[PDB]
Structure formats: C-alpha cells, structure tokens
Design a protein around this ligand. Structure first.
Ligand SMILES: CCCCC/C=C/C/C=C/C/C=C\C/C=C\CCCC(=O)O[C@H](COC(=O)CCCCCCCCCCCCCCCCC)COP(=O)(O)O[C@@H]1[C@H](O)[C@H](O)[C@@H](O)[C@H](O)[C@H]1O
Ligand SMILES: COC1=C(OC)C(=O)C(C/C=C(\C)CC/C=C(\C)CC/C=C(\C)CC/C=C(/C)CC/C=C(\C)CC/C=C(\C)CC/C=C(\C)CC/C=C(/C)CCC=C(C)C)=C(C)C1=O
Ligand SMILES: CCCCCCCCCCCCCCCCCC(=O)OC[C@H](COP(=O)(O)OCCN)OC(=O)CCCCCCCCCCCCCCCCC
Ligand SMILES: CCCCCCCCCCCC(=O)OC[C@H](COP(=O)(O)OCC[N+](C)(C)C)OC(=O)CCCCCCCCCCC
Ligand SMILES: CCCCCCCCCCCC(=O)OC[C@H](COP(=O)(O)OCC[N+](C)(C)C)OC(=O)CCCCCCCCCCC
Ligand SMILES: CCCCCCCCCCCC(=O)OC[C@H](COP(=O)(O)OCC[N+](C)(C)C)OC(=O)CCCCCCCCCCC
Ligand SMILES: CCCCCCCCCCCC(=O)OC[C@H](COP(=O)(O)OCC[N+](C)(C)C)OC(=O)CCCCCCCCCCC
Ligand code: SF4
Ligand code: SF4
Lengths: 116, 156, 329, 61, 56, 190, 123, 76, 24
C-alpha cells in the first residue's frame, strides 16, 4: 500500500499497453522476401566475462566493510588492506600475462633480406 | 580549352571565400589531428611499404603516404603549374595517419594556388584560337559565313 | 490511498514526459553544434516531435523473422523497458521525496542496473544468425566490463557516508559535494556512465520495427537520465544549491503550504539543473568524437582504469585513517 | 581585343592565410596539476572535517 | 630490373581489337619509373583463342 | 660531372636523410608534465571546446520553399521552346540540337508547312534520358530551345515526363519573362 | 591480391588433348558433387536431378569440338562458371538463367509449320 | 584447419554500391575479396560511339566528386 | 578593426589591357 509497489506493477502496464497499441493498430502483411554452422572466436572474448566474475565478487565483498567502517577502526582497516593487496597481486598477474588481448596474427614480417 | 569566360564579378568573390576558409580549415583540424581517439584509430592501420606501393600501382596520397616524393604537377607539369609556386606534403610511415596529414596539408597548398591564381590572372582569349576545333561566338556566327559553316559542322 | 496514487502518476507523468523531450533536445543541440537548425516542422518551435515519431512507430509493421524466438524477441524489450524504468523510484527530488524510502537505496539502484544487461544478450539470441550473436557478445562484454567500475565508484563514495540510504548521502553532502574532493572520480564516473549506456563515444556494435524499437528507444534514454541521476546524487549535490536560510527568514514567517511548495521548487530545481547539464554533456561528448575498436575498449577498461581504481581503493581509506575520520552509521 | 571581362586588381589582392593557425593555448601542465591537487586537497579538508563533526553529533544523539 | 630502366610501377594495361588483323587483339602495358620520371609502353598481340602470358 | 647511367641530376636532396627518432630520455618534457596531459585529457578538452564555441554561432540553413538558394543565369533546368516577338515558333528544324545531344534525347520530324516555311511537325525530348549538358542550347543558331532555371517540376508518371512540342511551347510561353533576364546576362558570354 | 579465392585455379593451358580431357572429367565431377548445395543455396522449386541433367546437357553441347585451343577457352569459361556458382556470388535470378524452359509454359500457339510461322510472320 | 567465417560488407560505411566479401577468424581478416561491378554501366563502350565533344560528359560522370579534374584529363 | 569598416574590393582600380599579345 505504499507508493513503491504501484510503480513495480505499473511500469509493465505502461509496456503491455504500448505494444498492445501497435499490435492492435499496425499492418502485419508479411511474405518470404520480407522475412529473413558456428564460428570460432578468440580466447579474450570468453576470458573477459569469465574473469569478470572474480572481480565482481570482490567488489561486493567490500560492501560489508564500507558499512562497518567505524566499528572496526584501525583493525578491520588493516584486514581490508591485506585483502585488497592479495587481490591486487592476482590482478598484476593478469596484466603481466597480457591475458585480455586479442593480438593481430600478421606482422610486417620483420625478417631481413639476405642472399646466396 | 574552356567552355566560356568567367562571370563578371567572381574573381573578387573567390578571394572573399579564401580569406575565411583559411580558418574554417584549422578549426576542423583541431578536433581530429591531436584527438587521441582519432589518433589511436589510425596510427599503424593501413601501413604500406614504399617498395610495394610501387608494385601495387598506387599513387597520389597513398604513394606519398609512404615517403616517395612523386606528384605529377611538379614532376611532369602541365596547365600553368609551372607558373604557380607551391610545396608538396609527403608522409613518412605508410599509415592512415600520414595519409590524413598530407590531405590536411594539400588543403593549404591548394589555397595557396587559389590566391596566387587570383593575383596573377591575365587577359585574353579563353578558348583556343581557331574555329575548326571549337565553336565561334554567337556574335560572329550570326553574321560571318565562314563562322556559320564552322558552327554547323562542329556540332553535327 | 488517493494520496499515493496521485503522487505516483504525477511522478510517472513527469519522468515519462522528460524522457520524450530529451530526444527532441538531443536533435536540436546536435544540430546547433553542427551549425544547422534542429526540427521546427512539427511543433510551434519543433516540440512534440518525439510524440510524432512515437505516433508513427506505433503504426509500424512488426517483422518476426524465420530465425527467431517470437516470445523472447518481444519480451526482451519489456524486461529492458521495465528495469530501465524501475530504478526511478529511489532518486530523491528533495529530502525524503522518493516513491519508496528504503534504507538500502544504493543496493537497489545497483541491483537494478545489473538487470539491464540481459535485454542486450538475450536479444542476440533473437534472430539466431552467426553475426547476430557475436555482436551481442561484444555488446554484453563491454556492458559488464564498465558496470564493474560503476559499482566500484559507488563503493568508494559510500566509504564517506557508511549508509546505503540515498538522501542520507545528500544530507551528508551539505558540508561539501563529493566531486570537489574527488574530481578524477567525476571524470572516471562520467566516462563509465557513457560506456554503460553504450553511447556513441563508446559504441561499437551499432558500428526491428515498432514496439520492440520504441521500448529499446525509451529504455536507452531512461538509462541516460537514470545514470545521470546516480551522478547527481552521489557525486554532485543531489538537491543542494546553497544555504537559503537567510532568504527564507526575509520572506516567510511560518510554515505554510506555499513555503513547502517554494522549498520543493528550489530543491528539485537544483536537482534538475544538475541533471540537465549532465544530459547536455552526454550529447556534447556524442558530437565531438569518433568511436572505439573493441580492443581499445577492453584495454581501456581492464588495463588503464581498473589499476588506477585499485590505487583509489588503497588511497581513500588510508586518508580516512591518517586523520581519525571514519564515518559513523 | 579585351573589353568587359573579369580581371584582377591593379595591385592584386592582399595575402590570405594558408599557414596552420594552431597556437599552443593554456597553462603549463604542472600548473593544472597543482591546481588539481589544491582543489582536491581543500575538498578533502572540508569532507574530513564534516565527517568528524558528524561523529560528534552521533555521540550527542 | 635494369638500373637504367627501373619501371617499377604498373600503371594501366588493356586490349584493343583490330578485327582486320589475323591476331585480333593487341595488349598494351603502361609502366612508370618514379625514379627517372619516365613512362614506357609495351605492345603485344593475341588472338581470341591464343593467350598472352601474365605479368602478375 | 658525367653521371653513371641509371643516374641523372636527380640525386637525393640535401637533407633527405632522416634524423634518428628521439628516445624517452632525450625529451624536453618532464614525465609529470607529459602524464598530466595524459590523465587530464588536454587536447580532448581543446577539441571539446571547439564545438562548444560552435554551439554559440549562426546556422546556415535556409528554408527551402520560402527561400531559394543561388542562381546564376547560366543555370539549367527544364526545357523551353521560345517564340519570336509577334509570336513565331523559332524552330526552323535545323536538327542541330538532335545531332549534338550526348544522350540522344531529342527526336524531331520536320515538314514544310503551308506557308512554305520550314518548321517542325514534331519536336520531342525524353527528360528521363536528358543529362542537362546545355549543348542543345549552345548549338541552336536561332536560339530556339533554352534551359529555364526551373528544377521544380518533379512528376509521378513517366508519361508526364516525355515532353512533346506542345509542352515545350507552353514552357517557352510561361518562362519567357524570366528567359529575358537569363539571356540579358548570358548572351555576351555565349 | 596474393591470396586467391577458395575454389580458384591458376589458369593453365594444355598442350595435350588428353590432359584437358582429364581436367574436363574432373570438372564434371566437381559440378555434380555441387548440385545439392546449388539446390539448397538458390532456393529452387524442383529437385537435384534436374540440376544434374542440365550439367550433363551443357556438357553434351560441346562434345564434338576438335580444336584444342577452343576446348581450352571452353574449359576456362566452365571453371569460372563453377567458381561463381559454388561461392554463392551469382544470385537466384541469374542461376535460373540456365532454366528458361522449366519455369513456365510461355503460352499457346507455338509455331512449328511454315504457315503458323507465317500467320504471325515469325513474331 | 582454421575455418574462416564469411560475410560481406554488402551494398546497404561501404560508401554505397560496393560489395566486400571478408573471411574472418574471430576478429582478424585472413582473406579479403572486393566485388565490383554493381555500378558498371559500360561508359567505355559508349564513348566509342559519340564524338569527342559528346564524349566529354562521360568523364565528369565517373569520379563524381572531382569533376573538373576528370574533364581536364580527357581534354589534355 | 571592424567588419563595418572593412573595405570593399568591387570598388577598385582593376587591370585593363588595350590589346592582348600571344605569340603563336
Ligand atoms: C493509446 C492511444 C493514444 C495513441 C495516439 C496515437 C494516434 C495515432 C493515430 C492512429 C490512427 C489509426 C490508423 C491505424 C491503421 O492503419 O489501421 C488500419 C485500418 O484502417 C484504419 O484506419 C482503422 C483505424 C482504427 C482507428 C481506431 C479505431 C478505434 C479503436 C479500435 C481498437 C490497419 O489495418 P490492418 O488490417 O492492417 O490492421 C490489423 C491490426 O492492426 C492487427 O491487430 C492485425 O493483427 C493485423 O492482421 C491487421 O489486419
Ligand atoms: C543521422 O544521424 C543520426 C542522428 O542525427 C544526428 C540522431 O539523432 C540519431 C538518434 C535517432 C533518433 C533520436 C530518432 C529517435 C526515434 C524515435 C522513434 C523517437 C521516438 C520518441 C518516443 C519513443 C517518445 C515516447 C514518449 C511517450 C510514449 C510518452 C509516455 C508518457 C541516430 C541514431 C543517427 O544515426
Ligand atoms: C598526473 C595527473 C594526475 C596523476 C594521478 C593519476 C590519475 C588521476 C586522474 C585520474 C583521471 C583519469 C581520467 C581517465 C584517464 C584516461 C587516460 C587515457 O588517456 O587513456 C589512454 C587510452 C589509451 O592509452 P594509450 O594506448 O597509451 O594512448 C594514449 C595516447 N597518449 O585512451 C583510450 O583508450 C581512450 C581514451 C578515452 C578518453 C575518454 C573519451 C570520451 C570521454 C570524454 C569525457 C569528457 C568529459 C568532459 C565533460 C565536460 C562536462 C562539462
Ligand atoms: C509540455 C510543453 C510542450 C509544448 C508543445 C507545443 C507544440 C505545439 O503546440 O504544436 C502544435 C501542433 C502542431 O502544429 P503544426 O501545424 O504541425 O506545426 C507546424 C509549424 N511550422 C509551420 C513551423 C512547421 O498543433 C496541434 O494542434 C497539436 C495539439 C496537441 C498538443 C499536445 C501538447 C502535448 C504536450
Ligand atoms: C562549471 C565547472 C567546470 C569549469 C571548467 C573547468 C575549469 C576551467 C579549466 C580550463 C579553462 C582555464 O582556466 O584555462 C586557462 C587558459 C589560460 O591560457 P593562456 O594563458 O591564455 O595561454 C596563452 C597562449 N597564447 C600566448 C597563445 C595566447 O586557457 C584560457 O583561458 C582559454 C579560455 C578558457 C575558457 C574556459 C572554458 C569555459 C568558458 C566559460 C567561462 C567560465
Ligand atoms: C562548459 C565549459 C567547457 C570547458 C571546456 C574545456 C576548455 C579547455 C581549454 C583548453 C585546455 C588547454 O589548452 O590546456 C593546455 C595544457 C597544455 O598546454 P601545452 O600543450 O603542454 O603547451 C605548453 C606550452 N605553454 C603552456 C607555454 C603554452 O593542458 C594541460 O596540460 C592540462 C589541461 C587539462 C584541463 C582539464 C580541465 C578539466 C579537468 C577535470 C578533472
Ligand atoms: C596520503 C596523503 C597524505 C597527505 C597529507 C597532507 C598533509 C595536510 C595536513 C593538514 C592538517 C589539517 O589542517 O587538518 C585539518 C582538517 C580539519 O580538521 P578539524 O576538524 O578542524 O580538527 C578538529 C580537531 N579537534 C577535534 C581536536 C578540535 O583535517 C583534515 O583531515 C584535512 C587535512 C588537510 C587536507 C589533507 C588532504 C589529504 C588528501 C589525500 C588524497 C590523496
Ligand atoms: S531547337 Fe534549335 S537546334 Fe533544335 S531544331 Fe530548332 S533551331 Fe535547330
Ligand atoms: S541539355 Fe543536353 S541532353 Fe538535354 S536535350 Fe540538351 S543537349 Fe540533349
């Protein structure tokens, strides 16, 4: 009965109304010419969304700390410092390995012109 | 030659245009030349070496993008490009960025041609002299028998 | 019960009008930046053109291809419409003026903003073509990659307040705004906000008809004004302009409905002027810049911005530590 | 003969601008960095002062 | 390849038919030496059925 | 001297040798100065401020059916067969406009009429295969067909767009006051 | 263009009649292997043995050609045709150039005799 | 066998009437193939049946953003 | 120093020849 839930139920009423208005209102009239295996992908594509999740789980692990920041003063501060640095080391692993690059397969072919 | 003579007051008008086009171009130059997004998008893109720019038969801004000093209006000149003084931009790395920079400079050089050609314009005929390859003027072919014959034959 | 439904349809009529006129505003200022007129053909000075376009596109033929889930393809518009619009509750137009005053408002605003990825990715599975998939892959990869640093900037700001309530942050910002100390964070948050909508500074995948188009269209600009609202409350002052106590002690003598009317006018005028300058800056950065390759974008987020953000994670609790300044609940 | 044509001036036109007019504008970068650090440090002054006041207010309540 | 010639750049190659000849087409080749600033042309012939060898 | 063979006076110019690119240590900018421009986006902001300046200036747009753009009298649009003073058709059927037309748009049949005067029985232009070179107007000794500066005659059928003798005589009727203005400024230059 | 297309062949001219017969039979095998992907690719009305009888018929047009150079030019044109058909470059409207006979009956009154050729003066 | 995925930059950033078959391995272009001829009209056959003055507009038809240069090369 | 007070160039003494000399 608050003004919070009329919103939750009323935004769909907005949408249901408008796509009704078009489906009820516009021409359908389709045909064949109007209508209409698998590819390979590089490793960094799947890598960005797989390694996305362990950083996201860290960001919501900071979320209990920054609400409790006064109560654990000088002590939970250092525990969080150690937590953050332990994960910064895995991040410097990740950017030292050049993991998230897609790198181009053709060079200028650097190898020189020798003879005989 | 040329189809017909200039209209009566156009030479005074191309000057008035050029005076402001000089700054209308620097303005376009500023949000691209040292834009870091425009830079990163074209720095090592489209690199052509100077030896295979010849083998592919490339010319103009793509051959001068690669370091080779060659353009026809300086090397094998024609149509009063001898009489007009200008310089030529030539890139060094074969990329899209130097092919961009030499166009942004050929703008400037063309404007230099325009003001030198408005200053140094002579009088005289604008078509070739004889009426056996292009037409007599309509003042003449309506009273001259020879010129009516030539006008009738150059068009049929 | 008359009171809250009249309040909510007042809020709905305001925000769903203002997302329509944002479209008319972007065309006109994109035109004047490009030294031409905007639309003046359809209103007295060009207005209700978004109405003209919506009137016509609700008359447009809907094509459901051979390739497609039909149900998935037309309710991905609605799930992106609904969660692009649900996040409009928690923003305050004044102290305690929201459609729901809940003590965890940033957690809600942060949970709804993660629900908005699906209607990209899911609608790639609509019209299953091999190029209709990996473009959606690049889209959703950029989307999640920049809502990471969005969430990060949020949690950096909550280190100063230690409360997930939103009007508590704005009342906390009365002593100083949060952009004035943390101005690099305003720059970082602006560019992450531009990425999170996939605006055409940071667009790659652009580079239907009818209802699945107008729902995506409305969701795009509702996301524009919603992340602008997020910037307005946690980084600029939310509804805060100046003190205005001396002006009131000149004008008024006691609490009346005209005094509360005047105070609400001042508060939401400050909030709206922040939001309007912010939307102008969105269109202004759209006008001036080319776009990104996917590799420039992923290199930008994961290799440049995120290590700097780790440095910010270390530096800001440490200065809250050096001077014994921890925020209390 | 030549009568009635478009001709240039007796002394010509005066020269137009064909050089790049891109003058280096702005302060030195260390001026902008010093101003940035000054603005940010003053904001941290006010923010940390306000947090300490809010803590004393919490003690009162 | 000769240092005197150095006709590096291919410019334009094409054919012209003269139907009154036994070998109907003649195939012309245009070359530019950007070093010595000089052009040259090379003309061979071809019937409709018989080939020319390719300089690709 | 005497040159080699494979050798003209086109030697390399004085200074065609590059200078070696500078390392990071032989640079006048400090690392702090250089990276302040890096992290504070300096020339991005410069190019931002350019278009911000352009927000505050006058647009170029003219309002088309209320305001037309440039006209020179030389300009070419639709066709017109003019008439003499005291009304005579001017087209003496000399076939020159047909002989010169680069896209073969003109077709004419010509017969001697009752007066013994030489006129066209049939004059015709296909405006779908016309290219507006103006050669038909340049060629005519009598100056019988001209180009009026009308471009606003866009049609809906192809049959409407095939102009016989009668449509072109009606055009040369209608636009004659205007073609006076065009040929008062063009006729010396022709 | 140093890399070439997938179903490319460096054009090469045979001094022997029999090695060109080898290449011709290999080409016929390539065509008839590719008849089902032609039927799927161009969305045709009919079924695959009509593509196969057209390939055989287009080869029995050119069986008694003697001169080796004319058979070389014929083989090169045929391989270019195969490369266009297999790579899905030709569209259905030009794939069905090969079947003018099959799409429809063009109407009545097919002139066979001298007189029904004469009544419409060959139209 | 790195199998390549094929698309076109079809006619409908292609500047109009170009077709460009690209063969990709993920992000990379391992093979390109421009198809050309969707604008080809046989102007070069048509010039042979016009006089030189009638053949003059065939030249500013082609490369239609730089007209006077196209006129100039034929006139020279 | 103004765009009001800028000189016109249409009012100018222009080049004028009696007769052009071009050798053949
Ligand atoms: C919320 C409202 C606020 C909106 C304001 C925007 C106003 C916009 C102005 C709207 C004007 C209406 C013009 C709409 C219009 O094209 O309908 C014409 C009919 O011919 C009229 O003209 C019939 C016109 C019908 C007008 C309404 C009739 C009363 C309402 C009936 C419900 C469409 O024929 P149609 O057979 O293809 O339409 C049907 C139908 O739209 C689909 O539901 C069927 O699935 C489909 O098969 C198809 O057959
Ligand atoms: C040509 O270059 C381009 C532009 O010009 C610079 C653009 O503006 C844009 C952006 C395009 C647009 C803004 C057209 C917008 C399309 C529309 C159909 C506008 C629709 C208006 C609405 C849906 C308003 C709806 C409001 C309600 C239903 C009120 C509810 C109470 C693009 C993509 C572009 O490519
Ligand atoms: C010494 C300074 C202080 C020291 C402390 C350390 C940092 C504190 C300050 C932090 C603030 C950071 C702001 C964001 C940093 C951006 C850094 C950057 O330039 O990215 C570089 C990146 C590519 O890097 P790279 O390949 O090396 O090439 C660079 C060319 N030199 O380039 C890219 O990938 C793309 C660059 C994108 C830039 C954003 C483009 C669109 C957004 C424009 C927003 C403009 C906002 C203006 C709004 C005005 C509102 C009134
Ligand atoms: C909120 C404030 C928005 C104000 C919008 C005014 C635009 C206007 O008033 O537009 C007037 C309209 C359109 O008139 P038009 O002939 O198409 O304009 C042509 C102008 N020219 C000549 C310059 C091209 O006319 C009407 O009857 C619409 C009546 C419904 C009004 C609904 C208003 C909803 C808000
Ligand atoms: C709303 C809050 C955001 C405010 C924007 C951010 C703060 C401003 C920092 C950059 C500007 C600055 O102060 O730069 C100061 C520098 C000074 O350079 P100089 O000494 O003249 O160079 C001399 C070089 N010569 C010798 C070649 C000439 O450039 C300028 O004056 C240029 C004008 C800047 C206008 C400011 C833009 C906003 C316009 C509205 C006026 C307020
Ligand atoms: C609505 C209001 C819009 C405001 C638009 C912005 C106006 C920009 C004016 C041009 C800037 C300029 O010119 O800065 C110029 C300088 C670079 O000088 P230099 O090239 O190294 O030359 C060196 C030789 N000197 C100095 C003798 C000429 O930049 C910088 O080092 C840093 C500039 C960053 C400014 C960012 C302000 C916002 C920061 C937010 C955190
Ligand atoms: C890691 C970076 C270290 C930087 C060190 C800088 C030294 C400055 C010392 C000035 C001391 C002072 O003036 O502080 C005074 C202020 C306000 O205090 P108050 O409420 O009035 O005191 C009340 C005392 N009672 C309760 C006993 C009455 O307090 C501060 O917190 C602000 C410090 C100045 C800005 C520091 C900026 C740090 C930004 C770091 C982001 C990287
Ligand atoms: S319009 Fe002119 S060129 Fe054409 S037939 Fe008449 S007089 Fe001759
Ligand atoms: S304008 Fe050119 S194409 Fe048209 S009718 Fe005249 S000569 Fe022919």
């Amino acid at each position: 009965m608050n003004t919070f839930i009329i919103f939750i139920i009323l935004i769909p009423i907005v949408g249901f109304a408008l796509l009704a208005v078009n489906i009820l209102l516009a021409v359908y009239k389709p045909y064949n010419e109007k209508l209409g295996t698998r590819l390979a992908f590089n490793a960094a594509f799947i890598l960005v969304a797989i390694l996305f999740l362990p950083f996201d789980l860290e960001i919501s692990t900071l979320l209990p700390y920054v609400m409790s920041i006064y109560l654990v003063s000088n002590y939970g501060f250092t525990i969080v410092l150690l937590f953050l640095l332990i994960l910064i080391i895995g991040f410097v692993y990740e950017i030292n390995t050049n993991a998230l690059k897609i790198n181009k397969h053709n060079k200028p072919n650097t190898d020189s012109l020798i003879y005989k | 030659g040329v189809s017909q003579d200039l209209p009566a007051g156009l030479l005074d008008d191309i000057y008035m245009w050029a005076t402001q086009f000089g700054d209308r171009l620097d303005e376009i130059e500023e949000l691209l030349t040292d834009n870091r997004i425009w830079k990163l998008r074209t720095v090592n893109i489209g690199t052509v070496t100077a030896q295979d720019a010849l083998n592919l038969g490339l010319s103009g801004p793509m051959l001068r993008g690669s370091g080779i000093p060659f353009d026809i209006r300086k090397n094998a000149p024609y149509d009063a490009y001898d009489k007009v003084d200008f310089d030529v931009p030539v890139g060094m790395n074969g990329d899209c960025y130097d092919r961009y920079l030499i166009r942004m400079a050929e703008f400037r050089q063309s404007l230099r041609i325009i003001e030198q050609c408005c200053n140094d314009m002579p009088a005289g005929a604008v078509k070739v002299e004889d009426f056996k390859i292009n037409s007599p003027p309509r003042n003449l072919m309506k009273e001259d028998m020879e010129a009516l014959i030539h006008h009738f034959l150059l068009y049929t | 019960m008359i009171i809250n439904i009249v309040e909510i349809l007042i809020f709905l009529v305001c925000v769903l009008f203002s997302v329509a006129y944002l479209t008319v505003a972007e065309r006109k200022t994109l035109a004047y930046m490009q030294r031409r007129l905007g639309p003046n053909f359809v209103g007295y000075y060009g207005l209700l053109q978004a109405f003209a376009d919506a009137v016509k596109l609700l008359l447009k033929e809907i094509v459901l291809p051979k390739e497609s889930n039909y149900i998935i393809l037309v309710i991905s518009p609605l799930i992106t419409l609904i969660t692009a619009l649900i996040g409009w509750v928690v923003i305050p137009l004044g102290p305690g003026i929201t459609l729901g005053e809940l003590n965890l408002g940033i957690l809600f605003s942060l949970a709804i903003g993660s629900l908005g990825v699906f209607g990209s990715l899911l609608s790639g599975w609509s019209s299953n073509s091999k190029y209709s998939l990996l473009g959606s892959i690049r889209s959703t990869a950029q989307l999640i990659s920049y809502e990471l640093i969005l969430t990060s900037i949020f949690i950096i700001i909550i280190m100063f307040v230690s409360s997930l309530n939103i009007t508590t942050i704005i009342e906390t910002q009365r002593v100083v705004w949060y952009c004035i100390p943390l101005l690099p964070l305003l720059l970082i948050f602006f560019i992450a906000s531009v990425a999170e909508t996939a605006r055409p500074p940071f667009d790659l995948t652009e580079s239907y008809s009818g209802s699945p188009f107008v729902f995506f269209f409305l969701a795009e600009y509702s996301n524009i004004i919603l992340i602008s609202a997020f910037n307005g409350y946690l980084l600029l002052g939310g509804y805060l302009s100046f003190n205005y106590s001396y002006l009131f002690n000149i004008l008024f003598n006691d609490y009346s409905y005209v005094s509360f009317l005047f105070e609400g006018l001042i508060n939401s005028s400050a909030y709206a002027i922040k939001l309007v300058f912010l939307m102008f800056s969105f269109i202004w950065v759209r006008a001036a810049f080319p776009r990104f390759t996917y590799d420039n974008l992923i290199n930008f987020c994961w290799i440049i911005l995120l290590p700097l953000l780790f440095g910010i994670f270390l530096i800001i609790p440490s200065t809250l530590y050096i001077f014994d300044s921890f925020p209390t609940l | 003969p030549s009568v009635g044509q478009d001709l240039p001036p007796v002394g010509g036109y005066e020269p137009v601008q064909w050089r790049r007019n891109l003058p280096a504008r702005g302060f030195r970068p260390l001026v902008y960095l010093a101003a940035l650090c000054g603005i940010c440090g003053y904001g941290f002054y006010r923010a940390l002062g306000g947090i300490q006041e809010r803590r004393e207010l919490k003690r009162e309540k | 390849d000769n240092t005197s010639t150095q006709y590096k750049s291919i410019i334009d190659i094409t054919a012209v038919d003269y139907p009154s000849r036994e070998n109907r087409f003649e195939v012309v080749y245009n070359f530019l030496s950007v070093r010595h600033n000089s052009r040259i042309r090379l003309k061979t012939y071809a019937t409709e059925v018989t080939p020319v060898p390719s300089i690709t | 001297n005497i040159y080699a063979g494979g050798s003209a006076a086109a030697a390399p110019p004085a200074g065609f040798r590059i200078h070696r690119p500078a390392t990071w240590e032989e640079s006048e900018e400090g690392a702090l100065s250089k990276a302040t421009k890096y992290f504070l986006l300096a020339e991005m902001f410069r190019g931002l401020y350019v278009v911000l300046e352009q927000f505050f200036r006058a647009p170029y747009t003219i309002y088309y059916p209320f305001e037309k753009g440039p006209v020179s009298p030389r300009f070419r649009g639709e066709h017109a067969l003019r008439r003499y003073p005291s009304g005579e058709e001017r087209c003496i059927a000399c076939k020159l406009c047909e002989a010169i037309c680069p896209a073969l748009a003109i077709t004419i049949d010509a017969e001697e009429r009752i007066d013994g005067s030489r006129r066209t029985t049939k004059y015709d232009i296909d405006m779908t295969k016309c290219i507006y070179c103006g050669y038909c107007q340049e060629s005519c000794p009598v100056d019988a067909i001209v180009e009026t500066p009308n471009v606003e005659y866009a049609t809906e059928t192809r049959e409407e767009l095939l102009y016989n003798k009668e449509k072109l005589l009606a055009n040369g009727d209608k636009w004659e006051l205007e073609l006076q203005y065009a040929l008062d400024a063009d006729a010396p230059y022709r | 263009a140093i890399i070439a297309t997938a179903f490319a062949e460096t054009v090469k001219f045979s001094g022997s009649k029999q090695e060109l017969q080898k290449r011709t039979l290999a080409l016929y095998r390539q065509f008839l292997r590719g008849a089902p992907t032609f039927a799927d690719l161009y969305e045709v009305q009919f079924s695959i043995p009509t593509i196969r009888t057209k390939i055989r018929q287009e080869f029995e047009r050119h069986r008694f050609v003697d001169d080796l150079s004319i058979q070389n030019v014929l083989y090169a044109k045929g391989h270019m045709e195969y490369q266009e058909c297999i790579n899905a470059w030709k569209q259905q409207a030009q794939f069905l150039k090969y079947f003018p006979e099959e799409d429809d009956i063009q109407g009545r009154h097919q002139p066979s005799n001298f007189v029904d050729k004469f009544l419409k003066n060959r139209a | 066998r790195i199998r390549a995925f094929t698309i076109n930059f079809g006619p409908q950033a292609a500047h109009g009437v170009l077709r460009l078959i690209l063969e990709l391995s993920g992000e990379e272009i391992i093979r390109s193939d421009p198809h050309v001829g969707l604008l080809h009209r046989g102007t070069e056959k048509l010039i042979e049946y016009k006089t030189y003055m009638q053949a003059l507009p065939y030249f500013d038809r082609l490369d239609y953003v730089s007209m006077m240069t196209n006129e100039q090369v034929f006139s020279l | 120093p103004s765009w009001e007070n800028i000189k016109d160039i249409r009012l100018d003494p222009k080049v004028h020849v009696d007769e052009v000399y071009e050798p053949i």
